[PDB]
């Protein structure tokens, strides 16, 4: 396909030429063609072996959770909300133009729910989604009980050293480590069958009801409503609560009037957001906005009218780099015991990390690459009656101690915080630190903050956060954990990682691995499990310089942390990621080695490079465990890339010739209204970020079979941007040129941006040259003008006599392209634009010539050129030369 597909709206894809002109009749309502109703919209699409694969989801979708029976998750048949999301394969049926016709249609059904699963789901509770307008102080939650309150009680740390052996806390120096955060105030937590609110607290430390469902709706909901009334063109004070309803609609939250639908519905609707296609499979994953708890492996062989089943992430073991890193995450999921009763969580029923904030998903060769953020999941005491941690989440910093032998392996396998709290505040000599200074009677013991006495009678259930933080507790370690600010005091000051907060996750998934997942999802009766063994994790905090005025040298915590966040988020503590995309390096590799491929993904403050070994389709590793897993590299943004609003991401393309990724941001995606219900007026324009590879890539020469330095990427705000125009599309014609299609008012306009030593600037003469197509598919040709086709002046016929070429025959001349380059002088419109003459015999004594000229995309066009089989009829001239001999 010599074309570019452009999504004109939620239903229509039009095919464009390299001349930024639509192919006539190509524009197609893919929803209508999928025989889907007018409630469906395109979520994502992809080309695989020249066919178009489309993910559609419905605004009418209604899902339910009934904790009893056991077909617990189902669609709501009553009314009209039985509207599952579909993937559809389209093929181009015509060889002239574009007639999309439907090939295969796959329904994405709701997860099976095992008995073991439904016992966790019964009491599963989920945080209200983070938005544009969520503040550091909105997230912040009331600090829970200390380790030594949980265990010994109201009473003393004079007995902390007499007692800590009788609660398996031997040598624990942290009686005032936090056991977590209160669910009586803050961001709303809700079961699968409940609805999140449109109101977010400004200070969640004071203003939320947390998981207090019943309390919200009889007390605090009327307060929120009177303080933060929806617009009605009202206006109020927004002293205690933002109103984010439109910001909510924006990120794909659905609504019956002013009330969001249940959590399970928003989970399903988000879950069907991104797609990727291999020879054998379609895989479907969720967006960067809500946590997703399941993904689809559809077998492309699937019979026509089947119901493809999603695999739970709680049933999907990843390799987090080392077993310890898994344990860290699983230990903090909840309390495990043979001794307790009805106390069910993901950990107690032997599930793993249940939820990811997925960056996106792609295919290279027959491989699925994904990445994303570990969505915080912890236990919470849902007990009723004198339970000390009642209504409290059970969470702790897991950040590596100061004394930890440096080198990555050691850092991420440090025993610090493994089974319970250890971190808070420490004044050694006079050198403050939040992190334990060492990790002597014997070695330091950590324990899960559920006191031995209540071990039988306690009720620890699972929750999921809206973000990559486990721990919302309004203490100083929380800020430092979230911002990447904990450092050792050694002769290098390597930064001390968490293994529960701000954890990024990526991998490459083989077709056998996707085969288990399909097996997990079809499993009769009990939960079948999947190992994905080509994965890694990484501590990836938000950058500290996206905040101000942090104290060191009244410690600053979440309720008081100041955000200066330039990337379109109020908050400066919760990381985000978007637009994972893979691509084959075009740069030759040494023969008998296979082509290189990577991927990249945007996170707050930087681009991440994932690196692969094409040999056995593995993550790049190196021998040393000192250097850190060489599958991952982080290149921080400058001012210019940091300024881009990441919540406006529209689409990411990769071009195999340039070896370059294009990230398109469209500001029309911004919500209509603020959290204070103020019309949003910077909703005009768009921006392009260009990512390239940097470093020494695998398999250049004998030296680059071995690598001990991870290849990386570089994101550059390219110069292609606007605060004025409405974007239709950006066509990356070549490294040297991009075409932008936009409306100033309401008609489409073509700008050409020219790369000038790395910075793209508009070329107004070339823009006018390209845009002057006169209704044709391609720019006009004018004899007397340097236009998009440069300028061609033919020699006079009198050159034959002068140069004694009359003694040459037509066949001689016609097979001597260097002679017939001497029949014209060419003036390029852009540097190194090229042109040749095609010759045609006309008589025994004469021929004609007609220029073949490169356009902006590096391709040659002539009289016979087509796009999508349609002759362009550009209008190149023909020129007779005559007086040559017959021999
Ligand atoms: C996470 C935690 O609990 N941190 C505390 C910390 C640790 O116990 C040690 O750092 C581990 O080696 O100690 C801090 O206190 C040092 C000073 O504390 C004084 O005791 C306080 C303390 O708060 C209580 O735990 C104690 O039982 O009684 C006192 C309360 O009135 C020492 O007696 C004093 O001489 C100091 O050495 C610390 O900052 O390092 C306090 C941390 O909360
Ligand atoms: K011309």
mmCIF file with all atom_site columns, C-alpha atoms in Angstrom, residues 508 593-597 611-621 698-699 705:
data_model
loop_
_atom_site.group_PDB
_atom_site.id
_atom_site.type_symbol
_atom_site.label_atom_id
_atom_site.label_alt_id
_atom_site.label_comp_id
_atom_site.label_asym_id
_atom_site.label_entity_id
_atom_site.label_seq_id
_atom_site.pdbx_PDB_ins_code
_atom_site.Cartn_x
_atom_site.Cartn_y
_atom_site.Cartn_z
_atom_site.occupancy
_atom_site.B_iso_or_equiv
_atom_site.pdbx_formal_charge
_atom_site.auth_seq_id
_atom_site.auth_comp_id
_atom_site.auth_asym_id
_atom_site.auth_atom_id
_atom_site.pdbx_PDB_model_num
ATOM 1  C CA . UNK A 1 508 ? 8.175  -9.842  24.511 1.00 0.00 ? 508 UNK A CA 1
ATOM 2  C CA . UNK A 1 593 ? 22.581 -12.465 12.043 1.00 0.00 ? 593 UNK A CA 1
ATOM 3  C CA . UNK A 1 594 ? 18.855 -11.471 11.858 1.00 0.00 ? 594 UNK A CA 1
ATOM 4  C CA . UNK A 1 595 ? 17.528 -7.869  11.519 1.00 0.00 ? 595 UNK A CA 1
ATOM 5  C CA . UNK A 1 596 ? 17.412 -5.811  14.815 1.00 0.00 ? 596 UNK A CA 1
ATOM 6  C CA . UNK A 1 597 ? 14.150 -4.490  16.293 1.00 0.00 ? 597 UNK A CA 1
ATOM 7  C CA . UNK A 1 611 ? 15.855 -3.692  23.391 1.00 0.00 ? 611 UNK A CA 1
ATOM 8  C CA . UNK A 1 612 ? 15.558 -7.255  21.981 1.00 0.00 ? 612 UNK A CA 1
ATOM 9  C CA . UNK A 1 613 ? 17.914 -9.992  20.665 1.00 0.00 ? 613 UNK A CA 1
ATOM 10 C CA . UNK A 1 614 ? 16.432 -10.949 17.278 1.00 0.00 ? 614 UNK A CA 1
ATOM 11 C CA . UNK A 1 615 ? 18.420 -14.249 17.482 1.00 0.00 ? 615 UNK A CA 1
ATOM 12 C CA . UNK A 1 616 ? 16.013 -16.093 19.910 1.00 0.00 ? 616 UNK A CA 1
ATOM 13 C CA . UNK A 1 617 ? 13.457 -13.182 20.313 1.00 0.00 ? 617 UNK A CA 1
ATOM 14 C CA . UNK A 1 618 ? 14.649 -12.468 23.935 1.00 0.00 ? 618 UNK A CA 1
ATOM 15 C CA . UNK A 1 619 ? 15.237 -9.289  26.004 1.00 0.00 ? 619 UNK A CA 1
ATOM 16 C CA . UNK A 1 620 ? 18.858 -8.119  25.536 1.00 0.00 ? 620 UNK A CA 1
ATOM 17 C CA . UNK A 1 621 ? 20.868 -9.240  28.592 1.00 0.00 ? 621 UNK A CA 1
ATOM 18 C CA . UNK A 1 698 ? 23.613 -5.413  18.448 1.00 0.00 ? 698 UNK A CA 1
ATOM 19 C CA . UNK A 1 699 ? 25.530 -7.210  15.633 1.00 0.00 ? 699 UNK A CA 1
ATOM 20 C CA . UNK A 1 705 ? 27.474 -9.762  19.380 1.00 0.00 ? 705 UNK A CA 1
#
